[PDB]
Design an enzyme around this catalytic site. Structure first.
Site, short mmCIF file in Angstrom:
data_model
loop_
_atom_site.label_atom_id
_atom_site.label_comp_id
_atom_site.label_asym_id
_atom_site.label_seq_id
_atom_site.Cartn_x
_atom_site.Cartn_y
_atom_site.Cartn_z
N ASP A 138 0.82 -1.20 0.00
CA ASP A 138 0.00 0.00 0.00
C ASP A 138 0.86 1.26 0.00
O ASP A 138 0.54 2.24 0.67
CB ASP A 138 -0.91 -0.04 1.23
CG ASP A 138 -1.93 1.08 1.26
OD1 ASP A 138 -2.27 1.62 0.18
OD2 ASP A 138 -2.39 1.42 2.37
N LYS A 140 2.32 4.70 -0.50
CA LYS A 140 1.73 5.98 -0.87
C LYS A 140 2.50 7.12 -0.18
O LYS A 140 3.24 6.87 0.76
CB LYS A 140 0.26 6.03 -0.45
CG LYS A 140 0.01 5.63 0.99
CD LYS A 140 -1.33 6.17 1.48
CE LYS A 140 -1.91 5.29 2.56
NZ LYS A 140 -2.44 4.02 2.00
N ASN A 143 2.96 7.59 3.64
CA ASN A 143 3.81 6.64 4.35
C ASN A 143 5.29 6.98 4.24
O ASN A 143 6.15 6.29 4.80
CB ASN A 143 3.58 5.21 3.83
CG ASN A 143 2.46 4.50 4.57
OD1 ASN A 143 1.46 5.12 4.96
ND2 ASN A 143 2.62 3.20 4.79
N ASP A 156 5.76 2.34 7.88
CA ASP A 156 5.39 0.96 8.18
C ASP A 156 6.37 0.03 7.49
O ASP A 156 7.31 0.48 6.83
CB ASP A 156 3.94 0.67 7.75
CG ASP A 156 3.30 -0.46 8.55
OD1 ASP A 156 3.79 -1.61 8.50
OD2 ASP A 156 2.29 -0.20 9.24
N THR A 165 -6.66 4.67 -1.66
CA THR A 165 -5.57 5.08 -2.54
C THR A 165 -5.26 4.03 -3.60
O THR A 165 -4.26 3.30 -3.51
CB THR A 165 -4.30 5.40 -1.74
OG1 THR A 165 -4.65 5.78 -0.41
CG2 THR A 165 -3.53 6.53 -2.41
N1 ANP Z 1 6.38 7.39 13.28
C1 ANP Z 1 5.75 8.55 13.00
N2 ANP Z 1 6.19 9.75 13.45
C2 ANP Z 1 5.56 10.90 13.16
N3 ANP Z 1 4.43 10.96 12.42
C3 ANP Z 1 3.89 9.83 11.91
C4 ANP Z 1 4.53 8.53 12.18
N4 ANP Z 1 3.79 7.58 11.56
C5 ANP Z 1 2.76 8.22 10.95
N5 ANP Z 1 2.82 9.56 11.16
C6 ANP Z 1 1.85 10.55 10.65
O1 ANP Z 1 0.59 9.88 10.50
C7 ANP Z 1 0.23 9.85 9.11
C8 ANP Z 1 -0.42 8.52 8.75
O2 ANP Z 1 0.59 7.51 8.80
P1 ANP Z 1 0.28 5.99 8.35
O3 ANP Z 1 1.50 5.15 8.63
O4 ANP Z 1 -0.26 6.04 6.95
O5 ANP Z 1 -0.87 5.58 9.40
P2 ANP Z 1 -1.73 4.22 9.32
O6 ANP Z 1 -2.66 4.26 10.51
O7 ANP Z 1 -0.81 3.03 9.17
N6 ANP Z 1 -2.61 4.47 7.99
P3 ANP Z 1 -2.22 3.98 6.48
O8 ANP Z 1 -0.75 3.63 6.55
O9 ANP Z 1 -2.54 5.17 5.61
O10 ANP Z 1 -3.09 2.78 6.22
C9 ANP Z 1 1.54 10.09 8.36
O11 ANP Z 1 1.36 10.69 7.08
C10 ANP Z 1 2.27 11.03 9.28
O12 ANP Z 1 1.75 12.35 9.09
#
Ligand code: ANP
Length: 280
Positions: A138, A140, A143, A156, A165
């Protein structure tokens, strides 16, 4: 596919954690699977340290020790994982540099060579995961973050998550026909296209149409890119995954040796010897 349930983790050095050892400070962002919080560890060897926190229902790692193996210079580190009350808490590096796309948007004049730096770090990260049998899936912009020094950090490492997306998805993914690490190199091409042109290669008025476009639409080659950049785009944008750059015998070396990346010393890059084009 071996599905590895994620239920508990303690980084070496740390002591087992639980929800009572943290306090919330603020919201860092919002993803598909929920908010990401800034937290402070209030007790223990790492008391006063700041981390990011995700709270999910569950998470699994599909793989075609592992939570340690996924460590990499350009991938977020998981410090703790624990479950309480049918919830999974993930405690991760606090990435301080904001997202890559936002940093680029603050610059009027960025170049192909600037973008190449970030793509190269991203390629090392992706291949690292592939080497462990993990597919990012995924990939994008949201991330792709930056640390305090301006280096790439993925948020991740291939977790299949459940919250409490299509534009970047490969054709073989869109039509549910199959799935390999080759799909990640398509997403990679899409990100490259978007950073180099400011536009997505495939986007319709809705998800249904975007998907059809990904499968069958024509795509003009950007004319103001270097021959080397154009070549890499052509080689990544193969709809047949088996023919896509990175899917051949030499794997990721097909990408690393490509003329687009001729300016990059991959070993120095890995060791963070190369200064990022921009600082946070
Ligand atoms: N380790 C981190 N430190 C600071 N900000 C973070 C961190 N991880 C995520 N973010 C913020 O949170 C947003 C979403 O992160 P994401 O890893 O996409 O969350 P998720 O819950 O896993 N959702 P998705 O990955 O979109 O399915 C990022 O674009 C950053 O703005």
């Amino acid at each position: 596919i071996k599905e590895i349930a994620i239920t508990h983790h303690v980084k070496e050095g740390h002591e087992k954690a639980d929800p009572s050892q943290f306090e919330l400070l603020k919201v860092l962002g919002q993803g598909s699977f929920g908010k990401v919080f800034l937290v402070k560890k209030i007790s223990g060897s790492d008391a006063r340290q700041l981390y990011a926190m995700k709270v999910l229902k569950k998470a699994t790692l599909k793989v075609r020790d592992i939570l340690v193996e996924v460590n990499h210079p350009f991938i977020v580190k998981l410090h703790y994982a624990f479950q309480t009350e049918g919830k999974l808490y993930l405690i991760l590096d606090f990435l301080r540099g904001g997202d890559l796309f936002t940093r680029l948007s603050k610059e009027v004049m960025f170049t192909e060579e600037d973008v190449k730096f970030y793509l190269a770090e991203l390629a090392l990260a992706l291949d690292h995961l592939h080497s462990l049998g993990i597919i990012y899936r995924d990939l994008k912009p949201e991330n792709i973050l930056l640390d305090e020094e301006g280096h790439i950090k993925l948020t991740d490492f291939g977790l299949s998550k459940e919250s409490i997306t299509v534009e970047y998805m490969a054709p073989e993914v869109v039509n549910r026909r199959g799935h390999t690490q080759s799909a990640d190199w398509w997403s990679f091409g899409v990100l490259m296209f978007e950073m180099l042109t400011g536009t997505l290669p495939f986007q319709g008025k809705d998800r249904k149409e975007t998907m059809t476009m990904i499968l069958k639409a024509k795509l003009g080659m950007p004319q103001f890119l270097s021959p080397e950049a154009q070549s890499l785009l052509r080689m990544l944008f193969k709809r047949n995954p088996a023919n896509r750059l990175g899917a051949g015998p030499d794997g990721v070396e097909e990408i690393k040796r490509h003329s687009f990346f001729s300016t990059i010393d991959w070993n120095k890059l890995y060791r963070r010897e190369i200064h990022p084009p921009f600082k946070p």
